[PDB]
Design a protein that fits this description.
Chain D: Belongs to the eukaryotic ribosomal protein eS21 family. Chain D: Keywords: Acetylation, Cytoplasm, Ribonucleoprotein, Ribosomal protein, rRNA processing. Chain D: It holds the Pfam family Ribosomal_S21e. The structure is cut from a larger assembly and holds nine protein chains of nine kinds. Chain D has one domain: Hypothetical Cytosolic Protein, Chain: A (2-Layer Sandwich), CATH 3.30.1230. Helices cover about 15% and strands about 20% of the residues of chain D. Chain D has a two-stranded antiparallel sheet. The chains are: A alpha+beta (about 220), B alpha+beta (about 100), C alpha/beta (about 210), D alpha+beta (about 90), E mainly beta (about 80), F mainly alpha (about 25), G mainly alpha (about 120), H little secondary structure (about 90), I alpha+beta (about 130). Chains C and D meet through helix 2 and helix 5 of C and strand 1, strand 2 and helix 2 of D. The structure holds one RNA strand of 163 nucleotides.
RNA sequence: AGGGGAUCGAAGAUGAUCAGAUACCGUCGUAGUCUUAACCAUAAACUAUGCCGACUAGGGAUCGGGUGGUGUUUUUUUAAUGACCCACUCGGCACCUUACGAGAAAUCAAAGUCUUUGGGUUCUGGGGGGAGUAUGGUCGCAAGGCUGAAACUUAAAGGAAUU
């Protein structure tokens, strides 16, 4: 019992919602961290690196450390968190504590004959965070992942197994490339494909159906 | 648009424009002008023998206060004064 | 379709055109309000009553659509409609807020200014632009009272009326109070009028 | 999508916008869901029937949704003279 | 607004914008018939004359050149055609 | 790095070099 | 610098919203009454909280202000005692001769035709 | 770099240049479009006008002012305390 | 000037989707445009369009759909061999499951898959998806 | 090379202040600042944003023209003209709120319609110095202009914003 003061936290506590497909479907906002980890407790975590950054004061140097970290299980779900803290111990936990909130699913598609399980993206996507952009190309079966080690682990924990990658600008900015890649894998679902050309019933949100479990 | 022409029968216009543009390379320029052949003291050679005439005590730049014990060597085929640097410790007496 | 019981009845029209609400904004016009109707000289505009009433019953349908009336919130920073919001808070749930709208009402999950709405209504988008801008961060549809030159962006349902006239803002607040009660079942007397009159929702200087 | 022998795939099939017919992002915070009731000739709206129109974040950004909900309502039959296709 | 009727626009809007910007090309100029007082002498005068036309009888100039239309004389019975 | 005065000095050097050239030819 | 601080201000309006009809304009019995309210440690601070509390109580006698709630700011008696100011507002007044003479209004709105004069200018 | 338009010159023509008036910081103004500060100060300052009115041989009449159209405040009036340095709220007026 | 009539018509299409419009006015209604717009209805990519004709050039009113993503014209007139069509769709097409880059042969105007069926190649205009 | 040569005024002559001041500051003062016939072909010659053509969120003001409303005025109220009002149009110089979009940001109704990369065309640049320098050509009375390197040296030069 974590006494959810919000509305979505009560829904996940009551057990009415058993998966995060529909909240992703309805784009309802998420501001609580436990829903992601309680629903997905098997995700793996790792930290790219630590960037020391300081703010100049009148006396001495007042320095912090910049930490970025990717969250998400190996099945189509992945997130990122960008944060800095006065010490490296709290930066990684402060990195992950906000990384769970921005978790987005993936548009895993096929490269040919759509025979086996999904392996790559269904379309090429782009993402521009700053002056650096990343171009993702669907890759044939067993072609592996062709990217720099800083970004190649993003694809590995994103649930995808082989995507051709292209980049522009200075890629040494790891946090910009990480977010540019993140923007790319979020825009891949923004592509309209003939398989979605059929209309949908547009189901109602479960919050309206389960509005009887409010605060009072 | 976007600068360079995009015409079907315009090939020669941006072909010559390409030639003037690649003229600005450091690689393209000295490859044909023969700077490594007419100005360099090696004549396009990876290695060359020579005769040591005297030694030098040239200092270093900032912030290092040291001397590398350089030596002066004269070539044979070309024949111009050239400075050389002793690689390892204790070899100055072997290149006296 | 509608059962034709929400037409332009004389009883709701006599008070509607007796409160100079038919006039619009000045010669400045926005294409989000195509309700221009043979613009009057001196630069003032005239809106058509039919579309305002038809969208007003539609807006009342939105409020009655929610199952829990508590989440309904009305935003008003202008001094004319402050008393209207608190008065509308008694007939239904209608969680009110007047004066300075606190920033981050929907966000900031620890503050005592927590709001968990589903529908929020703004009397004038120009003054309460913060509420509408914030409502797009928590996935909450907004209803707005927009004139012919008001900033009607970020709006789902716009009610064309005069937000500068003292009588008009309180008048529209009174009508939507009746209809939301009528569609909720509390007002069984569909044909009979409502006992309380319109100038209930009128702020005064003392 | 669907592969050859069944095995339903493409989890999280998203709703499509009802105004300009494009897809919306799962993290798109500018998209809202609007429900409209229906009164069956009794003077009070019966709950349980709510037509759901999808308003994308783009139509919200341009402020055209205010002049859009009348378009879809009149096409359904909820409005009579609010919307006029002729210009 | 994203839905507009460019196929069948309202005639009030069509007859207001510039002629080159309408749905179809059409001039706003028109012909007319004017009588010089006295003899009938049926003639047709186009509104944008840019000239001082006169009847075949004598110097009976009815319209004067102007930047826009032609300024008709004080005594003229012109009928829309 | 005053462009104007270093530029003027460059023209003075041009003058001197032209004089040196004209001494022989 | 004779300026009050929030330390005495947080305790003051807390006293007013809960313990208003206990004190009076008096000063020394206000000090004595402070002992009969939630315990306060320093007597020096007691000299200021009593001095502040009567200061707002001089202001309220000439018109109550914001930030106070002692069940008469929450009077709520017919809103501002005007509740339903009907006095036949939607009739009478000018409806005896019928009002809304107007110009270019529902007279040219062809949805329906209502009464009242339609010729002004 | 601030000062998009610098001054109000968007068209062409270059105008001309007039001398700067009693500044000791006179220079070529960037065209006639500068800070103006036109002055309508009276010939006689406030007070001491009662003596002038009494000493007038004829009654009423007089009381005109100096009508000086000034172009003297240009890029140096901060020394003369006329044009105030400001910040990103400079969007007021031009 | 009016160099490529295809540029303005196809570009004027491109702006109208990203702003979410419903109809587009198209000029100057050439034979290679009307056939360009003709091969989408059979694939359900644009819907229906109207041809209002005047004596000078005519005008096209295009009623579009949101299923479309992006359309363009490749300039200049490029030459395509039988060993080049698969090269082009692997270059500027997101995938082969969707999107049909089109081209014209001596026998009218078709798409890349349809021309692959033709066993013949030809002249390329642009891409549609 | 002539005319003119009043004010200002490269040089210069003086008087300051300054340790030093042929600089800032005061007064004179030649060439010049004006024009004629012939050269000079340069600038932060900037909107640092090439030209042509099409589309894209709005509003207001303004220049020139035009259209309609017994419009308000001007007399010989009224015929007219012209001054303006209202509504709109074309061509513009341009502004105000926002950013669907771009940009590293400053910002941009284009610096947008560029990885979802392709409307047509011309010119320029591949690290900073050396150096717009050497030489070779070319025009110019001269001063100068156009074209235009190399050797050698360095790991930094430069742009937008933050504390």
């Amino acid at each position: 019992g974590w006494v959810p003061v919000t509305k979505l936290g009560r829904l996940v506590k009551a057990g009415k919602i058993t998966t995060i497909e529909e909240i992703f479907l309805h784009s309802l906002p998420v501001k609580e961290f436990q829903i992601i980890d309680t629903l997905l407790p098997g995700l793996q975590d790792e930290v790219m690196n630590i960037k020391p950054v300081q703010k100049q004061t009148r006396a001495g140097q007042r320095t912090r450390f910049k930490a970025v970290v990717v969250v998400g299980d190996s099945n189509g779900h992945v997130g990122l968190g960008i944060k800095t803290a006065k010490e490296v111990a709290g930066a990684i936990r402060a990195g992950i504590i906000i990384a769970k909130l921005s978790v987005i699913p993936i548009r895993r598609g096929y490269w040919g004959t759509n025979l086996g399980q999904p392996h790559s993206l269904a379309t090429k996507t782009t993402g521009k965070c700053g002056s650096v952009t990343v171009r993702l190309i669907p890759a044939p079966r067993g072609s592996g992942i062709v990217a720099s080690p800083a970004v190649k682990k993003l694809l590995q924990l994103a649930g995808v197994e082989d995507v051709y990658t292209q980049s522009n600008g200075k890629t040494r900015t790891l946090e910009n490339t990480l977010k540019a890649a993140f923007v790319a894998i979020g825009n891949t679902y923004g592509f309209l494909t003939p398989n979605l050309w059929a209309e949908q019933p547009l189901p109602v949100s479960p919050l309206d159906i389960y509005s009887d479990e409010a605060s009072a | 648009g976007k600068g360079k022409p995009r015409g079907l029968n315009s090939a020669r216009k941006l072909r010559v424009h390409r030639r003037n543009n690649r003229w600005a390379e450091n690689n393209y320029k000295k490859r044909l002008l023969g700077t490594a052949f007419k100005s360099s003291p090696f004549g396009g050679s990876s290695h060359a023998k020579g005769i040591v005439l005297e030694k030098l005590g040239i200092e270093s730049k900032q912030p290092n206060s040291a001397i590398r014990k350089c030596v002066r060597v004269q070539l044979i085929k070309n024949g111009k004064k050239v400075t050389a640097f002793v690689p390892n410790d204790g070899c100055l007496n072997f290149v006296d | 379709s509608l059962p034709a019981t929400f037409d332009l009845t004389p009883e709701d029209a006599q008070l509607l055109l007796a409160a100079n609400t038919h006039l619009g904004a000045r010669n400045v016009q926005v294409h989000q309000e195509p309700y221009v109707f043979n613009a009057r000289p001196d630069g003032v505009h005239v809106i058509n009553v039919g579309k305002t009433w038809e969208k007003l019953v539609l807006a009342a349908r939105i409020i009655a659509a929610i199952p829990n009336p508590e989440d309904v919130v009305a935003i008003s920073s202008r001094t004319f409609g402050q008393r209207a919001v608190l008065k509308f808070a008694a007939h239904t749930g209608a969680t009110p807020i007047a004066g300075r709208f606190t920033p981050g009402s929907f966000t900031n999950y620890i503050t005592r200014s927590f709001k968990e709405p589903r529908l929020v209504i703004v009397t004038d988008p120009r003054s309460d632009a913060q509420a509408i801008k914030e409502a797009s961060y928590v996935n909450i549809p907004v209803i707005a009272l927009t004139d012919l030159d008001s900033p009607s962006e970020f709006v789902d349902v716009a009610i064309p009326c005069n937000n500068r006239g003292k009588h008009s803002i309180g008048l529209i607040w009174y009508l939507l109070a009746r209809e939301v009660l009528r569609l909720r079942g509390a007002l069984v007397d569909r044909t009979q009028p409502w006992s309380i009159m319109p100038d209930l929702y009128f702020y005064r200087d003392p | 999508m669907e592969n050859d022998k069944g095995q339903l795939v493409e989890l999280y099939v998203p709703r499509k916008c009802s105004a300009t017919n494009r897809i919306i992002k799962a993290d798109d915070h500018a998209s809202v869901q609007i429900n409209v009731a229906k009164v069956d000739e009794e003077g009070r709206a019966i709950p349980g029937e709510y037509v759901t129109y999808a308003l994308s974040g783009y139509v919200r950004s341009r402020g055209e949704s205010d002049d859009s909900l009348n378009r879809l309502a009149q096409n359904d039959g909820l409005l009579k003279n609010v919307w006029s296709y002729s210009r | 607004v994203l839905v507009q009727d460019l196929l069948h626009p309202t005639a009030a809007s069509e007859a207001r914008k510039h002629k080159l910007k309408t749905l179809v090309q059409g001039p706003r100029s028109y012909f007319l018939d004017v009588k010089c007082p006295g003899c009938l002498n049926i003639t047709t005068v186009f509104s944008h004359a840019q000239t001082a036309v006169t009847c075949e009888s004598c110097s009976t100039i009815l319209c004067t050149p102007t930047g826009g239309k032609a300024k008709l004389s004080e005594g003229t019975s012109f009928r829309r055609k | 790095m005053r462009a104007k005065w270093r530029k003027k000095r460059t023209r003075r050097l041009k003058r001197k070099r032209r004089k040196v050239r004209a001494r022989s030819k | 610098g004779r300026v009050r601080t929030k330390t005495v201000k947080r305790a003051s309006k807390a006293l007013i919203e809960r313990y208003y009809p206990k004190l009076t304009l008096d000063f020394q019995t206000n000090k004595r009454l402070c002992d009969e309210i939630a315990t306060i440690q320093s007597k020096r601070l007691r000299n200021k909280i009593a001095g502040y509390t009567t200061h707002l109580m001089k202001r309220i006698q000439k018109g109550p202000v914001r930030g106070i709630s002692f069940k008469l700011q929450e009077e709520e008696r017919e809103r501002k005692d005007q509740y339903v100011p009907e006095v036949s507002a939607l009739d009478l007044s000018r409806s005896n001769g019928v009002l809304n003479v107007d110009n270019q209004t529902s007279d040219l709105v062809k949805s329906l035709g209502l009464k009242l004069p339609l010729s002004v200018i | 770099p601030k000062k998009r338009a610098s001054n109000g010159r968007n068209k062409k023509g270059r105008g001309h240049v007039k001398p700067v008036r009693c500044v000791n910081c006179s220079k070529s103004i960037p065209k006639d479009k500068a800070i103006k500060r036109m002055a309508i100060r009276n010939i006689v300052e406030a007070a001491a006008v009662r003596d002038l009115s009494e000493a007038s041989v004829y009654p009423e009449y007089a009381l005109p002012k100096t009508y000086n159209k000034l172009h003297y405040c240009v890029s140096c009036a901060i020394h003369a305390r006329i044009v105030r340095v400001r910040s990103r709220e400079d969007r007021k007026n031009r | 000037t009016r160099s490529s009539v295809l540029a303005d018509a196809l570009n004027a299409i491109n702006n109208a989707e990203k702003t979410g419009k419903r109809q587009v006015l198209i000029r100057p209604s050439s034979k290679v445009i009307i056939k360009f717009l003709q091969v989408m209805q059979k694939h359900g990519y644009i819907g229906e369009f109207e041809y209002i004709d005047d004596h000078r050039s005519g005008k096209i009113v295009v009623q579009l759909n949101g299923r479309l993503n992006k359309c363009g014209v490749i300039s200049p007139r490029f030459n395509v061999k039988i060993g080049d069509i698969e090269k082009w769709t692997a270059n500027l097409l997101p995938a082969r499951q969707f999107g049909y880059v089109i081209l014209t042969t001596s026998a009218g105007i078709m798409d890349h898959e349809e021309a692959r069926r033709k066993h013949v190649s030809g002249k390329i205009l642009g891409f549609v998806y």
